[PDB]
Amino acid sequence: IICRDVARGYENVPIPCVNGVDGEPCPEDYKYISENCETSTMNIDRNITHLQHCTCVDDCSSSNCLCGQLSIRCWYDKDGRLLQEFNKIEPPLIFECNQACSCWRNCKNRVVQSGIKVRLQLYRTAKMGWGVRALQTIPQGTFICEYVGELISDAEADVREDDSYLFDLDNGEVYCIDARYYGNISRFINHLCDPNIIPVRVFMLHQDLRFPRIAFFSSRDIRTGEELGFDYGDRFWDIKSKYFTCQCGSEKCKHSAEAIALEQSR
Amino acid sequence: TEKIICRDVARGYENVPIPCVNGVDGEPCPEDYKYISENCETSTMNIDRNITHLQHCTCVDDCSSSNCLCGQLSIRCWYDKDGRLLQEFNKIEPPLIFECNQACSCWRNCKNRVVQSGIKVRLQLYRTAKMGWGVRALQTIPQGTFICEYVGELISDAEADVREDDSYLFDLDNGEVYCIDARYYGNISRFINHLCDPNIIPVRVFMLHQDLRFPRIAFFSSRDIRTGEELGFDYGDRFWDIKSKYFTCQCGSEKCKHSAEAIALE
Ligand SMILES: *CCC(=O)Nc1nc(NC2CCN(C(C)C)CC2)c2cc(OC)c(OCCCN3CCCC3)cc2n1
Ligand SMILES: C=CC(=O)Nc1nc(NC2CCN(C(C)C)CC2)c2cc(OC)c(OCCCN3CCCC3)cc2n1
Ligand SMILES: C[S@@+](CC[C@H](N)C(=O)[O-])C[C@H]1O[C@@H](n2cnc3c(N)ncnc32)[C@H](O)[C@@H]1O
Ligand SMILES: C[S@@+](CC[C@H](N)C(=O)[O-])C[C@H]1O[C@@H](n2cnc3c(N)ncnc32)[C@H](O)[C@@H]1O
Ligand SMILES: [Zn+2]
Ligand SMILES: [Zn+2]
Ligand SMILES: [Zn+2]
Ligand SMILES: [Zn+2]
Ligand SMILES: [Zn+2]
Ligand SMILES: [Zn+2]
Ligand SMILES: [Zn+2]
Ligand SMILES: [Zn+2]
């Protein structure tokens, strides 16, 4: 219980920091930001007239909502949680309602843009450094947080010393997000071979497809105190395996030293 | 008699609802515009959003000390303990206000973040006797209270020349000159009328960026405002030299400088 809010009041709820494992102080070699930033011109298309929008006069719960149609359908239920029909392995693009829509700010297609609602905690793990865990039970499909950081080109990523906080934004031109120097609570979520949250690309106040915003949703019910983690992917582990191995301790672990040694012996 | 025609013309985008009533005639709620709570662009403005270009404070307090760089850029911080402008504030020639930003080390609740926190007072869009639609107070507003931001579409000075309707223009006189046009896109401030005895004053504020070409316009009450009193500021003589040949001022004040009487009498 060393810092009551690492977000300095920038989020909807505080995010405290605790360490009950070692003597490492709550980390401060970064700059907490709640929204994405840029350190050089990104030229995001912010033209309000280029936004696809809906004409709904209800709460956008009908199948006629265009923004829902943009995302095949609206995948948020009445409580703002992803339907279990959601393709959790290959998620679609989610187009939330925006400032050009005729609907109200409280419509059913505005989950990610409303911010963090669940209670999270920055805590010291036993073998992974810092991690994030739930201070409450989280039902499946609930929005957790956004991967927030410094928008950079992939040419700039090629000269970055530390690539441990990078999120690729595939789409022509390639961009990505770096949470090394600027980032939010998501920069502390570790890899898990049995993940409980998944990343989804979402569009809100703009629709420039080069800059999708990364939202994390729970892939299953999560108990209190349970660590949150998503699948970092093979690109991360083909690179970092030579310096360290995965410590998630799951019987399904693909990137442990024992797992790597088992299949590279065939 | 007076009918309530809209519960909230902002449709839930502001901190508080802004209702629309009419007890004068049968004009329905205005809908020849798109309500937006924040400024928009229809053509690229190329605002400098580089986070490293942000002058910021290293304050570990609530930014009330004389060492806050952000307050120093406005000579001093002009907000009192409650977020109201000091009475010594230059109401004739307001200085540029630099509120604390995302690069500052302070918390989101520091004393230098009044305008970026949104509308707090209760306003109402109503039908005036002779001035079309207006905005009035539903409470008492002490002197120096932040009222609302003049929100609209950011355009160049050349674009304003080719605009059919120049009744909703606010000029940002910097270097390169730009304007806020609330004709097609605007918020509650687009309904504030001119008063020869004004009770609010515009102040130019910088928040998440510090591009001097694009200051944000904040209305603060220039003195105590009684409940039911209409809100208004001095449009300036550029507006009136253009409009006085098409219509006259109906503020009905003992001090009117733009009525057909006052104009002809000199
Ligand atoms: C933006 C385009 C892109 O894919 N960038 C990128 N690069 C790397 N690897 C290196 C390559 C060269 N390095 C030096 C020689 C300069 C710099 C970067 C990269 C590596 C990753 O894993 C180590 C990585 O990851 C993917 C996501 C993992 N999680 C996501 C959230 C946090 C980490 C991404 C990488 N991207
Ligand atoms: C430097 C760029 C720039 O600001 N330009 C510009 N242009 C105008 N009209 C042109 C339109 C046509 N054109 C010819 C070439 C036809 C020449 C005149 C303006 C008119 C204004 O009121 C009439 C005005 O009032 C501002 C205050 C008024 N209230 C309204 C609510 C808020 C403030 C400002 C105007 N500013
Ligand atoms: C995005 S950061 C996550 C936060 C990080 N653990 C910290 O303390 O700052 C990713 C880094 O955390 C560590 N990490 C994440 N997942 C891991 C895992 N499953 N096993 C071992 N280390 C992991 C690795 O060092 C990796 O470089
Ligand atoms: C920014 S709009 C204000 C809202 C306007 N009353 C409406 O109904 O939409 C400015 C226009 O309102 C009218 N107006 C504003 N102040 C006025 C005044 N003091 N006397 C007469 N008309 C005024 C003028 O027609 C002017 O072009
Ligand atoms: Zn809709
Ligand atoms: Zn909607
Ligand atoms: Zn919509
Ligand atoms: Zn593992
Ligand atoms: Zn400060
Ligand atoms: Zn501050
Ligand atoms: Zn500051
Ligand atoms: Zn007058």
Handedness of CA A13, A14, A15, A19 (dihedral sign): negative
One-letter-per-residue 3-state SS of A207-248: CCCCCCEEEEEECCCECCCCECEECCCHHHHHHHCCCCCCCC
One-letter-per-residue 3-state SS of A31-76: EECCCCEECCCCCCCCEHHHCCCCCCCCCCCCCCCHHHHHCCCCCE
In degrees, to the nearest 5, what angle opens at C-alpha B121 toward C-alphas B117 and B123? Answer: 125
Task: Name the residue among A33, A41, A46 with its Cβ closest to that of B102.
Answer: A33
CA of A39: which chain B residue's CA is closest?
B50
Are A83 and A77 a contacting pair, CB within 8 Å?
yes
Query: How would you class B92 by CB atoms within 10 Å of its CB: exposed for 0-12, middle for 13-18, buried for 19 or more?
Result: exposed
Question: Cα(B43)–Cα(B181) distance, rounded to whole angstroms?
Answer: 13
Say which amino acid occupies B151.
V
Quickly tell me which residue has 């909703």 as its tokens.
Answer: B168
| Of the candidates A100, A1, A8, the residue with the CA atom closest to the CA atom of residue A53 | A100
| Of the candidates B168, B171, B172, B118, the residue with the CA atom closest to the CA atom of residue B146 | B118
Beta bridge partner(s), residue A201: A214
Q: Report the structure determination method.
A: X-ray
B179 lines ligand 2 (CB under 6 A): yes
Question: Cα(B151)–Cα(B161) distance, rounded to whole angstroms?
Answer: 20
Q: Does A63 touch chain B (CB under 8 A)?
A: no
Say which amino acid occupies A60.
C
Task: Name the residue among A8, A38, A104 with its Cβ closest to that of B50.
Answer: A38
> Are A105 and B11 inside 8 Å of each other by CB?
yes
CB within 8 Å of B172: residues ≥ 6 apart? B178, B179, B180, B204, B213, B214, B215, B217
B252 lines ligand 4 (CB under 6 A): no
Beta bridge partner(s), residue B233: B194
Handedness of CA B173, B174, B178, B181 (dihedral sign): negative
One-letter-per-residue 3-state SS of A120-163: EEEEECCCCCEEEEECCCECCCCEEEEECEEEEEHHHHCCCCCC
Quickly tell me which residue has 């109201």 as its tokens.
Answer: B84
Are A50 and A95 a contacting pair, CB within 8 Å?
no
Residue burial A155-188, b: 16+ Cβ < 10 Å; e: rest:
eebeebeeeebbbebeeeeebbbbbbbbbbbbbb
Give, using CA atoms, the residue closest to atom 25 of ligand 1: A236
Question: Cα(A92)–Cα(A110) distance, rounded to whole angstroms?
Answer: 16
Question: Cα(B23)–Cα(B128) distance, rounded to whole angstroms?
Answer: 9
Q: How many helices (H) and strands (E) does chain A have?
A: 4, 14
Are B5 and B127 a contacting pair, CB within 8 Å?
no
Q: Looking at chain A, after which residues does the C atom sit over 2.5 Å from the next written N, breaking the chain?
A: 171
Question: Cα(B196)–Cα(B239) distance, rounded to whole angstroms?
Answer: 13
Q: What tokens were used for A202?
A: 């979402």
How distant is the Cα of B33 from the closest Cα of chain A, in angstroms? 11
Q: What are phi and psi of A174, to 5 degrees?
A: -100, 130
Quickly tell me which residue has 């700059």 as its tokens.
Answer: A31
Q: What tokens were used for B101?
A: 């930003």
Q: Does B31 touch chain A (CB under 8 A)?
A: no
Q: Does B11 touch chain A (CB under 8 A)?
A: yes
> Are A37 and B185 inside 8 Å of each other by CB?
no
How distant is the Cα of A150 from the closest Cα of chain B, in angstroms? 9
CA of A10: which chain B residue's CA is closest?
B108
Q: What tokens were used for A246?
A: 């995965």
A156, A205, B46, B237 from A42: Cα distances, Å: 12, 16, 10, 40
CB within 8 Å of B9: residues ≥ 6 apart? B18, B19, B20, B29, B35, B125, B188
**How many alpha carbons fall within 13 Å on the CB side of residue B7?**
4
Say how many Å lie between the CA of residue A193 and the centre of ligand 8: 4
Q: Does A33 touch chain B (CB under 8 A)?
A: yes
Give, using CA atoms, the residue closest to atom 35 of ligand 2: B169
CA of B101: which chain A residue's CA is closest?
A33
Are A246 and A253 a contacting pair, CB within 8 Å?
yes
Are A215 and A200 a contacting pair, CB within 8 Å?
yes
Contact residues, chain A, for B37 at CB < 8 Å: 99
Beta bridge partner(s), residue B179: B155, B171
Q: What tokens were used for A175?
A: 């961009």
Q: What tokens were used for A17?
A: 């920091």
Q: How many residues in chain B?
A: 266
A236 lines ligand 3 (CB under 6 A): no
How distant is the Cα of B69 from the closest Cα of chain A, in angstroms? 18
CB within 8 Å of A26: residues ≥ 6 apart? A2, A3, A6, A17, A19, A122
Task: Name the residue among A43, A46, A103 with its Cβ closest to that of B41.
Answer: A46
Q: How many residues in chain A?
A: 266
Q: What tokens were used for A79?
A: 């409580």
Beta bridge partner(s), residue A132: A122
Q: Does B185 touch chain A (CB under 8 A)?
A: yes
> Are B42 and A33 inside 8 Å of each other by CB?
no
CB within 8 Å of B195: residues ≥ 6 apart? B230, B232, B233, B234, B251, B253
**Which residues of A are documented as binding site for Zn(2+)?**
54, 56, 60, 65, 67, 97, 101, 103, 107, 193, 246, 248, 253
Are B56 and B207 a contacting pair, CB within 8 Å?
no
B249 lines ligand 4 (CB under 6 A): yes
Question: Cα(A180)–Cα(A166) distance, rounded to whole angstroms?
Answer: 8
CB within 8 Å of B227: residues ≥ 6 apart? B137, B138, B139, B140
**Integer Rg of chain B from CA:** 19
Are B98 and B104 a contacting pair, CB within 8 Å?
no
End-to-end CA distance of chain B: 40
Question: Cα(A20)–Cα(A121) distance, rounded to whole angstroms?
Answer: 13
| Of the candidates B253, B136, B256, the residue with the CA atom closest to the CA atom of residue B193 | B136
Q: From the alpha carbon of A236, which atom of ligand 1 is closest?
A: 22
How distant is the Cα of A213 from the closest Cα of chain B, in angstroms? 17
Q: What tokens were used for A163?
A: 């690539």
| Of the candidates B205, B247, B246, B251, the residue with the CA atom closest to the CA atom of residue B231 | B251
B160 lines ligand 2 (CB under 6 A): yes
Pocket test for ligand 3, best of A29, A160, A164, A188 (most atoms within 8 A of CB): A164
Contact residues, chain B, for A31 at CB < 8 Å: 103
| Of the candidates A84, A91, A125, the residue with the CA atom closest to the CA atom of residue A198 | A91
Say which amino acid occupies B112.
N
Are B95 and B202 a contacting pair, CB within 8 Å?
no
One-letter-per-residue 3-state SS of chain B: CCEEEECCCCCCCCCCCCCEEECCCCCCCCCCCEECCCCEECCCCCCCCEHHHCCCCCCCCCCCCCCCHHHHHCCCCCECCCCCECCCCCCCCCCCEECCCCCCCCCCCCCCCCHHHCCCCCEEEEECCCCCEEEEECCCECCCCEEEECCEEEEEHHHHHCCCCCCCEEEECCCCCEEEEEEEEECHHHHCEECCCCCEEEEEEECCCCCCCCCEEEEEECCCECCCCECEECCCHHHHHHHCCCCCCCCCCCCCCCCHHHHHCC
